[PDB]
């Protein structure tokens, strides 16, 4: 019960701030990808997608991967095994989103607009 009481009073060791800041980003991203794969597939509507924000989505997903990496090592530098088995997934978790949000792009490539 000591562990929570300390950090309840005051701020946090560095690893917790970054890592959790990628969990919200993982959800904020999980929402949008769901709606985009919703509209592309179920209601088969090609209007209510991204393609107005196709860059900020990808940019953030780079941050959401990088921030997990920096936060992970701090936990592993501290060595707390609870964090160690925790963050490593969050690196691979957000690694799943990036490789999925990237295949939704090469799928909706003939459905976005044109640039060349």
């Amino acid at each position: 019960m000591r562990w929570r009481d300390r950090i309840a009073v005051l701020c946090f060791p560095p690893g917790l701030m970054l890592t959790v800041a990628a969990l919200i980003l993982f959800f904020i991203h999980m929402g949008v990808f769901a709606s985009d794969v919703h509209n592309f597939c179920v209601i088969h509507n090609y209007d209510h997608m991204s393609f107005r924000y196709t860059v900020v989505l990808i940019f953030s997903q780079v941050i959401s991967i990088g921030w997990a990496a920096m936060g992970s090592l701090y936990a592993e530098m501290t060595g707390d095994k609870f964090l160690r088995c925790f963050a490593l997934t969050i690196l691979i978790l957000n690694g799943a989103m990036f490789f999925n949000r990237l295949c939704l792009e090469f799928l909706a490539i003939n459905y976005r607009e044109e640039r060349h």
Binding site: Y46, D47, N110, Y111, R112, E113, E114
Partner: protein, 56 residues
């Protein structure tokens, strides 16, 4: 009834190969494109979201 305006294509595709459709660009490129049935050219939105109302 005789005054008109004409555009020379400038491509010089022979009629016989135009019927054939495999005329070669001195390299191997196809002069003539055979459109798929019920083709409609794309719209502004995407190559796969047509809205023309004209059929080819």
């Amino acid at each position: 009834y005789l005054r008109t305006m004409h555009h020379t294509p400038g491509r010089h595709i022979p009629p016989e190969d135009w019927i054939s459709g495999v005329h070669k660009d001195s390299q191997g490129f196809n002069m003539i494109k055979t459109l798929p049935i019920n083709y409609r050219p794309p719209s502004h939105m995407g190559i796969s979201i047509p809205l023309t109302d004209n059929f080819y």
